[PDB]
Amino acid sequence: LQALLLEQQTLASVQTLDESRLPEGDVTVDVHWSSLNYKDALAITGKGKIIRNFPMIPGIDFAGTVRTSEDPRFHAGQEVLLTGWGVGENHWGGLAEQARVKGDWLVAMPQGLDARKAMIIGTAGFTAMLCVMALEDAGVRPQDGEIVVTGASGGVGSTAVALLHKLGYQVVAVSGRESTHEYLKSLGASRVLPRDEFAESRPLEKQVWAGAIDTVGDKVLAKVLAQMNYGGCVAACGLAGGFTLPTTVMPFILRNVRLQGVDSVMTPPERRAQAWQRLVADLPESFYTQAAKEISLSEAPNFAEAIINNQIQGRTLVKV
Amino acid sequence: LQALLLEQQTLASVQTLDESRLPEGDVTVDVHWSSLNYKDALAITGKGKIIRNFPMIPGIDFAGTVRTSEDPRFHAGQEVLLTGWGVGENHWGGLAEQARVKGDWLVAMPQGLDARKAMIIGTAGFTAMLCVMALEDAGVRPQDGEIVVTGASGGVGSTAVALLHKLGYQVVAVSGRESTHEYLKSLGASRVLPRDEFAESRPLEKQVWAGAIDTVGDKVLAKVLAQMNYGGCVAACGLAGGFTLPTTVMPFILRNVRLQGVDSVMTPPERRAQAWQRLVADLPESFYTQAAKEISLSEAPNFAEAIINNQIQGRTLVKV
């Protein structure tokens, strides 16, 4: 099998690997499509620290066809996808012709999706949906008020804007780059605020948001919390602005606000399948037709460098 | 009507007040029982800053009999209770023979409770129940693991221990005073930890709690969050240790943890009635027989001074 292998000598190169070297697992998948998520781009370039164990095949997402299975519920030829579970990080992942994983980690290809579309959605889309579902579990409906999405030009934020807009919510996108203002309104944002206004905050500010999907954390998350309506919910899933959360208890104890953390890496199979079904029903068709860059494994190093310095618009997909 | 009136000249004295001076409201209640909550004790002594508007009648909780009503659903002679809504803080409250309030603020005396028992429970008990209900809304059940209660010797924490224990949970009480260790085990705590161990924390610590009810905030709340099991929920309702919350996004984004804020002051009527019904079904009988100090209005100043320096064990009730 061909695979982009990361070694610490980080040298990223395409290599031929014996089937016996694949990690332990009861399902082997013939990968047809993977991706270069931001996590994968850091991994490949040697920046960040998402990878402790080498050698490593990156790709936190993949989709393709089941080759072999000892897991009763998966059969040869069945299309499946996978995101998360440490795959591409501490377990050989998607940037390879084959991946061996636990069956509990896979998702049966939902009706209405295929391998390519599933990788277009990705971890980013999966996470966005889980955030939207969190808002719904908290009772946040379209009639309750405006929903703010932070880091709205990134994968997660962008998809959250379209999901929310499709579902009837009035969305306010928060973006740091003035160059995305127009694109975000195309997706469904009624207004766009700069990230610079979401910095220092008092413990409580004027109540403006019914709900929020935050991808940035740090001070932006702190500001949004102090701006939450009574009984509002923030779904938090990222740390692009910093991993700390310098907030107070006041939104919580005086405004009954819920901070619901949303992990995508280890989400249980039931919740996970539920989210993929929801993505099929709620993602508009215009979301799938977006231009994606398809690359071979051998181009992943150069394209990884481009994604890091920010030279790419939209999805980089890997056709394997 | 007789009333303990606070004036800023804070002079706390019992005075005779004309009915015409009562604040706007469509229900007048003949108060039979009120309380000295900690908020009321600060107010009376002139310490803290819970009161901006003078003159003021304190007492955030009261229960008694409806005198007059323009609200269709309340009739003369009907027993009712009230907690919160700013009553006793910015609206004349319970330490008086009469209180005039909005009907939306009152609770019809639930079956199985009376005025005295309702004031024994109090804001503290009402808050505890809302915390327990938050844990349940988050899917936290007895089989999921240990529940930690912080500030467990205070009103809220103490009641939460008994509610949780009655409902089948394994409870760990966290108390700062070594002098409450024995009392807390009587209530239902399987073990008792010192508050000193709940200080500095890494972003993520070993997973030990299925759920948590926090009354302290600040660093204790931060520690508890980093100790939450995957998918766990903390119900946060206090600030005894500080109003800030120096935590990170890591429990949230990597462990799917919910921080559910619990406000008692403005909780909607439906939720509120629901909580009082739950308190009747889940509070053990041994909870009501606890020794309470009954005082007249004229003793409230001296007893307020005792509650502030901590000289009183259990409830101070005001018989009006």
UniProtKB/Swiss-Prot annotation, chains A, B:
Task: Cite the CDD domains for this sequence.
Answer: MDR_yhdh (cd08288)
GO MF annotation list? acryloyl-CoA reductase (NADPH) activity; protein homodimerization activity
Superkingdom is: Bacteria
Q: Which residues bind NADP(+)?
A: Y38, S153, G154, G155, V156, S175, G176, R177, R195, L239, I253, S264, N310
Q: What is its EC number?
A: 1.3.1.84
Q: In terms of one coarse class, where is the protein primarily found? A: cytoplasm
Record's GO cellular component terms? cytoplasm
Q: Which UniProt keywords apply?
A: Cytoplasm, NADP, Oxidoreductase
Name the chemical reaction catalysed here: propanoyl-CoA + NADP(+) = acryloyl-CoA + NADPH + H(+)
Report, from the record, the phenotype seen after gene disruption. 100-fold increased sensitivity to acrylate, about 8-fold increased sensitivity to 3-hydroxypropionate. Acrylate is bacteriostatic, not bacteriocidal. Can be complemented by acuI from a number of other bacteria, including Rhodobacter sphaeroides strain 2.4.1 (AC Q3J6K9) and Ruegeria pomeyroi (AC Q5LS56).
Cell compartments where the protein resides: Cytoplasm
One Pfam match, given by its short name, reads: ADH_zinc_N
The cross-references to Gene3D superfamilies, in alphabetical order and at most eight, read: Medium-chain alcohol dehydrogenases, catalytic domain, NAD(P)-binding Rossmann-like Domain
Give the matching PANTHER family.
Answer: ACRYLYL-COA REDUCTASE ACUI-RELATED, SHORT-CHAIN DEHYDROGENASE/REDUCTASE
Q: Any miscellaneous information on file? A: The zinc-binding residues of the alcohol dehydrogenase family are not conserved.
- Give the multimer and partner information: Homodimer.
NCBIfam families named in the record: oxido_YhdH (TIGR02823)
Similarity comment text for this entry: Belongs to the zinc-containing alcohol dehydrogenase family. Acrylyl-CoA reductase subfamily.
Purpose of the protein = Probably catalyzes the NADPH-dependent reduction of acrylyl-CoA to propanoyl-CoA.
State what protein this is by name. Answer: Probable acrylyl-CoA reductase AcuI
